[PDB]
DNA sequence: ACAGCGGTCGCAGGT
DNA sequence: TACCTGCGACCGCTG
């Protein structure tokens, strides 16, 4: 066994055992030749990034929990997880040599950083004689294949995208890999010999530098929770079958949607498995919704954005971004700060920004409200600033999804009906007329009657005192006047669209 | 050509 | 309940 070669699976996304072709392939190969190989399933953790402010504490905790679950599940297959601290550039040269790696597998990703990181790894592997097998299992459809089927271009409308993907085959969804047979623990490398726990899963203390930023642990990380949560969602087949996104509440105290996004983002849940389960249900339920508003339709939106994103490295910026309207957003530092911390003076907006910071998830339409307010609706601040804040706070932060939906909300791409503007006062009332959600997340306003809790500036000073919260003292004065600025911004939007039109027809 | 259709998720005021 | 209309006058696709 001093002569064994090592098979490595590199986890980045795809933090699950189920439906993981890259992982299954390694386990299958090991069991094929019994005394031949050692198996190392690894996650590479750069210990310097633990302070990167672009990752908030709630998301670190989710990753910590996820790695622990992944180690637990691997232990059942007579394996374990190896969390190797460092950067791939230095880690791979060392372990290819140390472990005598024969093969390396991972799930592909389309993000710019990942494309260049993986090309580097492929380059090293090729030069060092390591075979590399990659798999597209993060999405149901391979963006490269969609773009190729569409003659070299990513489809820019959803219905056209659907028309392409129904021409594509959907791969088989796999189970969990097989238990390893006759597999002693690998020999310690030089790092392990110095410290036996060198590759153990990180503790909370090691991942979470700022525990004071942690909120209630409403969505625990890992594949186990992912499947449990999915199964609980799929249980009411009528709800599943009749689901229409636009009719779900943004302010219900309990989520009106699945809340599978963080699990889909990390790959704790396979999108292909979830797609498969939904199809089985739709087949059973004669009365059901269809894309774009159906539950399957939502998975297809995820697929849609991954595809437009895969063709555009600047997807997360305005400048140099092929899809994006060039719009003269403004710098408004004080306003940005107030929006970021849920101190705009609009209680609905503030409640949402507060839930997001505290819990790491807010409903899609709650994201609409704050994203509209920040950009074209009210503050006239760049969607890129909003994206930055969401990136920090969201458990489900997803490069492609965040960028795509921020462009949609700001009417920069995909959505163009800018005359439709969410009211920070009116929008939430439809689903929460008593303002329970505001009372919860903005407790200072909790005694305000429903008749002015969405618009506290309507309360006289004697009323404010009776409610125990005086504006400008206990809660902020509204930063801008929606009824004025949104009308001026609609005009700004039309003006920018016109400039973009000229430029287009001008390139001809 | 260039107008007409459809477009995941607007508001306010109708009935 | 769950539509309907005016507001002003978007885009991408289609033929
Ligand atoms: C400004 C803005 C920023 C966003 N940033 C992210 C993000 O960083 N990461 C992320 O996962 N979602 C993002 N979303 C999309 C959407 O709001 C979330 O995916 C959804 O709220 C997740 O909740 P759920 O799992 O209950 O969704 P469900 O309605 O139960 O849908 C199931 C799954 O379908 C996918 N899905 C649903 N809606 C969308 C959508 N609009 N776009 C793409 N996929 C979707 C998600 O994977 C979701 O988990 C953003 C939306 C907006 C408006």
PDB file of N, CA, C and O (backbone and C1' of nucleotides) in Angstrom, chain A residues 156-157 160 416-417 497 501 504, chain C residues 7-14:
ATOM      1  N   UNK A 156     -31.404  35.601 -25.073  1.00  0.00           N
ATOM      2  CA  UNK A 156     -31.670  36.691 -24.148  1.00  0.00           C
ATOM      3  C   UNK A 156     -33.111  36.846 -23.669  1.00  0.00           C
ATOM      4  O   UNK A 156     -33.402  37.698 -22.858  1.00  0.00           O
ATOM      5  N   UNK A 157     -33.998  35.996 -24.163  1.00  0.00           N
ATOM      6  CA  UNK A 157     -35.353  35.940 -23.638  1.00  0.00           C
ATOM      7  C   UNK A 157     -35.646  34.531 -23.154  1.00  0.00           C
ATOM      8  O   UNK A 157     -35.134  33.555 -23.690  1.00  0.00           O
ATOM      9  N   UNK A 160     -37.391  31.915 -25.570  1.00  0.00           N
ATOM     10  CA  UNK A 160     -36.408  31.409 -26.516  1.00  0.00           C
ATOM     11  C   UNK A 160     -35.453  30.429 -25.838  1.00  0.00           C
ATOM     12  O   UNK A 160     -35.082  29.433 -26.407  1.00  0.00           O
ATOM     13  N   UNK A 416     -37.784  45.725 -19.114  1.00  0.00           N
ATOM     14  CA  UNK A 416     -37.685  47.063 -19.676  1.00  0.00           C
ATOM     15  C   UNK A 416     -38.856  48.000 -19.406  1.00  0.00           C
ATOM     16  O   UNK A 416     -38.813  49.137 -19.800  1.00  0.00           O
ATOM     17  N   UNK A 417     -39.889  47.501 -18.743  1.00  0.00           N
ATOM     18  CA  UNK A 417     -41.102  48.255 -18.452  1.00  0.00           C
ATOM     19  C   UNK A 417     -40.933  49.093 -17.191  1.00  0.00           C
ATOM     20  O   UNK A 417     -41.600  48.887 -16.209  1.00  0.00           O
ATOM     21  N   UNK A 497     -32.505  55.195 -21.856  1.00  0.00           N
ATOM     22  CA  UNK A 497     -32.891  54.231 -22.875  1.00  0.00           C
ATOM     23  C   UNK A 497     -32.728  54.845 -24.259  1.00  0.00           C
ATOM     24  O   UNK A 497     -32.279  54.186 -25.193  1.00  0.00           O
ATOM     25  N   UNK A 501     -30.458  53.557 -27.297  1.00  0.00           N
ATOM     26  CA  UNK A 501     -31.006  53.314 -28.636  1.00  0.00           C
ATOM     27  C   UNK A 501     -30.162  53.933 -29.728  1.00  0.00           C
ATOM     28  O   UNK A 501     -29.885  53.297 -30.745  1.00  0.00           O
ATOM     29  N   UNK A 504     -26.943  52.041 -30.241  1.00  0.00           N
ATOM     30  CA  UNK A 504     -27.145  50.785 -30.944  1.00  0.00           C
ATOM     31  C   UNK A 504     -27.291  51.014 -32.440  1.00  0.00           C
ATOM     32  O   UNK A 504     -26.426  50.627 -33.223  1.00  0.00           O
TER      33      UNK A 504
ATOM     34  P    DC C   7     -54.849  58.300 -19.964  1.00  0.00           P
ATOM     35  O5'  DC C   7     -53.537  58.003 -19.111  1.00  0.00           O
ATOM     36  C5'  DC C   7     -53.566  58.330 -17.722  1.00  0.00           C
ATOM     37  C4'  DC C   7     -52.272  57.845 -17.112  1.00  0.00           C
ATOM     38  C3'  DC C   7     -51.031  58.180 -17.936  1.00  0.00           C
ATOM     39  O3'  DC C   7     -50.212  59.016 -17.147  1.00  0.00           O
ATOM     40  C1'  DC C   7     -50.982  55.965 -17.104  1.00  0.00           C
ATOM     41  P    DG C   8     -49.276  60.144 -17.787  1.00  0.00           P
ATOM     42  O5'  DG C   8     -48.319  59.352 -18.793  1.00  0.00           O
ATOM     43  C5'  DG C   8     -47.537  60.091 -19.716  1.00  0.00           C
ATOM     44  C4'  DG C   8     -46.484  59.174 -20.293  1.00  0.00           C
ATOM     45  C3'  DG C   8     -46.423  59.147 -21.822  1.00  0.00           C
ATOM     46  O3'  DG C   8     -45.245  59.771 -22.360  1.00  0.00           O
ATOM     47  C1'  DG C   8     -47.189  57.066 -20.969  1.00  0.00           C
ATOM     48  P    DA C   9     -43.799  59.115 -22.152  1.00  0.00           P
ATOM     49  O5'  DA C   9     -43.809  57.766 -23.013  1.00  0.00           O
ATOM     50  C5'  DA C   9     -43.345  56.566 -22.391  1.00  0.00           C
ATOM     51  C4'  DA C   9     -43.744  55.354 -23.208  1.00  0.00           C
ATOM     52  C3'  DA C   9     -43.223  55.408 -24.636  1.00  0.00           C
ATOM     53  O3'  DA C   9     -42.779  54.126 -24.986  1.00  0.00           O
ATOM     54  C1'  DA C   9     -45.594  55.190 -24.664  1.00  0.00           C
ATOM     55  P    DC C  10     -41.647  53.938 -26.088  1.00  0.00           P
ATOM     56  O5'  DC C  10     -40.613  52.917 -25.385  1.00  0.00           O
ATOM     57  C5'  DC C  10     -39.678  53.360 -24.416  1.00  0.00           C
ATOM     58  C4'  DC C  10     -39.163  52.149 -23.661  1.00  0.00           C
ATOM     59  C3'  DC C  10     -38.676  51.001 -24.535  1.00  0.00           C
ATOM     60  O3'  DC C  10     -37.319  51.247 -24.856  1.00  0.00           O
ATOM     61  C1'  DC C  10     -40.087  50.187 -22.823  1.00  0.00           C
ATOM     62  P    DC C  11     -36.671  50.828 -26.248  1.00  0.00           P
ATOM     63  O5'  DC C  11     -36.398  49.250 -26.046  1.00  0.00           O
ATOM     64  C5'  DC C  11     -35.495  48.783 -25.027  1.00  0.00           C
ATOM     65  C4'  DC C  11     -35.675  47.289 -24.800  1.00  0.00           C
ATOM     66  C3'  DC C  11     -35.386  46.462 -26.049  1.00  0.00           C
ATOM     67  O3'  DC C  11     -34.205  45.728 -25.875  1.00  0.00           O
ATOM     68  C1'  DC C  11     -37.539  45.889 -25.129  1.00  0.00           C
ATOM     69  P    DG C  12     -33.554  45.051 -27.155  1.00  0.00           P
ATOM     70  O5'  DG C  12     -34.265  43.627 -27.233  1.00  0.00           O
ATOM     71  C5'  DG C  12     -34.270  42.674 -26.188  1.00  0.00           C
ATOM     72  C4'  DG C  12     -34.934  41.420 -26.709  1.00  0.00           C
ATOM     73  C3'  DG C  12     -34.381  40.962 -28.051  1.00  0.00           C
ATOM     74  O3'  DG C  12     -34.356  39.550 -28.018  1.00  0.00           O
ATOM     75  C1'  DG C  12     -36.688  41.490 -28.297  1.00  0.00           C
ATOM     76  P    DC C  13     -33.949  38.708 -29.316  1.00  0.00           P
ATOM     77  O5'  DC C  13     -35.379  38.412 -29.966  1.00  0.00           O
ATOM     78  C5'  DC C  13     -36.356  37.644 -29.267  1.00  0.00           C
ATOM     79  C4'  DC C  13     -37.603  37.517 -30.130  1.00  0.00           C
ATOM     80  C3'  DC C  13     -37.411  36.954 -31.552  1.00  0.00           C
ATOM     81  O3'  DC C  13     -38.272  35.803 -31.651  1.00  0.00           O
ATOM     82  C1'  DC C  13     -38.767  38.914 -31.595  1.00  0.00           C
ATOM     83  P    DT C  14     -38.216  34.766 -32.870  1.00  0.00           P
ATOM     84  O5'  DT C  14     -39.275  35.432 -33.859  1.00  0.00           O
ATOM     85  C5'  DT C  14     -40.616  35.532 -33.436  1.00  0.00           C
ATOM     86  C4'  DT C  14     -41.427  36.292 -34.463  1.00  0.00           C
ATOM     87  C3'  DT C  14     -41.135  35.897 -35.910  1.00  0.00           C
ATOM     88  O3'  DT C  14     -42.240  35.115 -36.303  1.00  0.00           O
ATOM     89  C1'  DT C  14     -41.432  38.286 -35.640  1.00  0.00           C
TER      90       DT C  14
END
